């Protein structure tokens, strides 16, 4: 079915920002595996194989409306050397992606495409609370220390 | 343990190979999907698993010798539009891979990194298996007509 | 104990042709799996190791009757190109042998061996099978066109 | 996938020589059963299917690089007529291949076919297997003698 | 079999390394055991247990080339007195093992030991895994300092 | 807790005899292995585990005690060329160690020792019955011969 | 059965010891557990029960030597009141017990008192590897530090 082009724009690039996700997160999930910080590991690697959840979602819906979906483009991965950095990392491109999630999710309700719409909040969701972990982990850092929270991310 | 800086660049040249097929075998699995091609899509998704797992294992290795991994750069995706194509699309691109497949391992023989050269062997055998069925794929679709091969692949 | 010499003498020559029908049903049946014809594969495959299984008897019951199995001379395979010859070529082979087993079944009634007699008689009885099965895989051909029934072999 | 020329002759040279075995094998494994020495017959029997699996996978690799099988040539047969001497023969005709084995490992190797080098690579370690197994029997009718090491082999 | 003489050589310089393996984990492990080091403890005594099944591969090896594994020189330890100079000689020991092998692997390609070199290999591929291991640690001890490092290896 | 520097001295001198029994039945175990008398090097395997296991025992009394295991000395290993010499080789290894080890427990009676003085009772014990082992095989082999005794320790 | 004068008198002076160190160790338990240090806690209470445990088997070797236990006189308790002086005080107790136990098994031996002295060296046995446990924890306290020896002690 025919869907909106601009709607397909909008998915489209919310596309490329997951795209982005999930090569940062599942390099820095290998980084932790090799610093031998594995909990650390597990986790990243799971916002990373979320992310790929994610991209699933939005390329089906994108050929569903018609479309061809983008996994061309590569954006700006922000790595980091090292833990507290990454983490940073991680939370900056959590938020320079919020602002596009809502604004197509605005989009998408102007235009009575209720469907995509519903998609789109379920990833907001997810979003919203790797946020919530990443501030969480940032915080906690201040409150015992460095050297504290990477010793008790080895198992 | 820091490795041969030349082994590095090999690992990592092939790393991009990877992620290329990654994207294309996706992209090709969820378009099968949504053609009702069930089957093919199935085989391709699972292509596309493989790749990652690839990825991930070059990613671990490079990691080890102590070099920077690159999911940076992503090179050129040969898209489909319809079946046929999208087969030779991929044939093409798990061919222009082995010659560098080869490369590396003929170099890391050189070099003495054995251990970098087992591991690129083990792609390298899986590769030469897409490829088997591939062919074989484009060679059926000569043997027993396009229509009943798509056919074939809806369930 | 001693057996009669012509009587070993008939079985040998089936012998020989028992092999010959080994290694021609076995490169037809890997012939068949390269070419992604599955169904073929497997019951080619299975004939073949019938075949196996037919040799066995046989050099028991000459080793038995004390003479010394042949298993040096190789007949000429007949070797098909494509799925319709490589069937006929099988269904010729079966039947250039039938001659043979009812030509040494007579010998031992004559003979009075007749334990022989009744190893020849159930690899008659399996023979005549492969021929029922190979004439109406030809037969299926010309109803339903080539190109279905290969569409047929492939899973 | 056209496979090297060279690569394919010696494949096929391999493949002429496991044939070999697997009728000399089978041959001796039940002239062992048919003087009543099981444990003997049992082993040899193993083998004769081992060499079968080598064949198969040399089948295999022959169609996939475009070659063509040859089963048709079965080159000689040494058979003994006494244990003592059907040991050696089969020590003798695995010693005799091992050359041809260590040759095709250098050849893949030189034309970067590491593929087939493995799976040659295979097949050397466990033809080093059964020759070890036969020095090791004939070592033993030594320490033993003769007459103990056949009633050993009854059961 | 006879083996190639300097293979024998390579290959027992190999043995002898490991045999220093064993001893220096062993008491190295027995020692954290009785610090309360008992997760340090259990692993440097699975590390002990890797290179006696090594040095077992390799005697049967040497064995079957018909040569005299040397079980009777056994080179100088280096025991630390204290976790990281235990971790420290742990390292050394297993990077000066490594040109060893690599030495002994390109020997056995030269004369084509190819089952010899496949031995090699692997090891190899385990001495890695035990000096990223080790260096793995020692980088922990900088990142959370040792009091925190130590407290996590207690049981 | 400090322990009697004599203690320390004996200990040191039965672990050190200890590791030679290890090295010395862990080869006379494979060298049976690769002759085929499998029954004879089981036992001998386990016997070299037995005095791996006892060796532990020294190690672990000895750091408690506080005093330093001593790996470096290793002395010199008695090995046979053939299995009647073999038998020998460790009955008298096993007969050249029996008075230091009650010498040992002398010692660790008259002063106080009385854990030490245990634990060397029971090692002792074990000492014991291998030693009842090899004089039973050596007896075995002049009622039977060594013919029969070989035969008997194949499977 | 009538017993020696002096051993029942050995036994008592025995026995008196064991019932300090119950009161002590259950004190010290109970102390460990109110500040929560359960951990800790829970250990010293199985030692608490183990030398009651002691002093059971030491009243039933009374009686049946037909002398009448002493369990009126209780010795003076070295109670602790901060986790390292606790450590300090069983560790003291631990060894202010041992030369009387030596001296019991020692006069034992002297009067053909077997049983007696099997009994008391099991006991010396037990009470040597509790004084392990006590030297390690104050090391561990000396390697990480108080506050982290304590925050293992938690759960
Ligand atoms: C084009 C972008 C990608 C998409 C759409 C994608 C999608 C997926 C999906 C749908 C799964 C299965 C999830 C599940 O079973 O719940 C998966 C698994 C996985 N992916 Fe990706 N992926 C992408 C890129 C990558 C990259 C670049 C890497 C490596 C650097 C990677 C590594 C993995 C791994 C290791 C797994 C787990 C496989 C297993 O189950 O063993 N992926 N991916
Ligand atoms: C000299 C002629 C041969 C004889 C007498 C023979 C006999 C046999 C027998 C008795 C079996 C076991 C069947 C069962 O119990 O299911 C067998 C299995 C087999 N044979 Fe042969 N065979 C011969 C030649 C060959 C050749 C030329 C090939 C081709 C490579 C081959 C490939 C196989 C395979 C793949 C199996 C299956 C083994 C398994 O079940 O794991 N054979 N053969
Ligand atoms: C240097 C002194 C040694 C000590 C203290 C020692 C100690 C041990 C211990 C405690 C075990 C585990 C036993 C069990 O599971 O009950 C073991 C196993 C073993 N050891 Fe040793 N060992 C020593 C030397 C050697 C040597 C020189 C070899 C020869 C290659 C060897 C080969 C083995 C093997 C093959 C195993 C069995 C591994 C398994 O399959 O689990 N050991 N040793
Ligand atoms: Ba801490
Ligand atoms: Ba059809
Ligand atoms: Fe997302
Ligand atoms: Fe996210
Ligand atoms: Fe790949
Ligand atoms: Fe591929
Ligand atoms: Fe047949
Ligand atoms: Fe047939
Ligand atoms: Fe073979
Ligand atoms: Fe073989
Ligand atoms: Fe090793
Ligand atoms: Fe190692
Ligand atoms: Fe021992
Ligand atoms: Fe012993
Ligand atoms: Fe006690
Ligand atoms: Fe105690
Ligand atoms: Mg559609
Ligand atoms: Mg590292
Ligand atoms: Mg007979
Ligand atoms: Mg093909
Ligand atoms: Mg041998
Ligand atoms: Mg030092
Ligand atoms: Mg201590
Ligand atoms: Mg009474």
Redesign the interface.
């Known amino acids: 079915m025919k869907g909106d082009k601009i709607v397909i724009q909008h998915l489209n690039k919310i596309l490329g920002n997951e795209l982005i996700a999930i090569?940062?997160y599942?390099?820095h999930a290998?980084?932790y595996?090799?610093?031998?910080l594995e909990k650390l590991g597990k986790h990243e690697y799971h916002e990373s194989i979320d992310e790929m959840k994610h991209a699933?979602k939005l390329?089906?819906r994108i050929?569903?409306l018609e479309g061809?979906?983008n996994?061309?483009?590569?954006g700006k991965?922000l790595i980091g050397e090292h833990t507290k950095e990454m983490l940073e990392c991680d939370l900056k491109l959590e938020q320079a992606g919020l602002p596009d999630l809502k604004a197509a999710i605005a989009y998408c309700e102007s235009v009575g495409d209720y469907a995509s719409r519903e998609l789109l909040e379920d990833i907001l969701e997810s979003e919203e609370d790797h946020i919530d972990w990443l501030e969480t982990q940032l915080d906690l850092i201040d409150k015992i220390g460095l050297?504290?929270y990477?010793?008790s991310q080895?198992?």
Do not use: A, V
């Open positions: 090569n940062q599942f390099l290998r980084m595996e090799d610093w031998g699933d390329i089906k050929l569903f061809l979906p996994l061309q483009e590569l991965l050297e504290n990477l010793q080895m198992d």
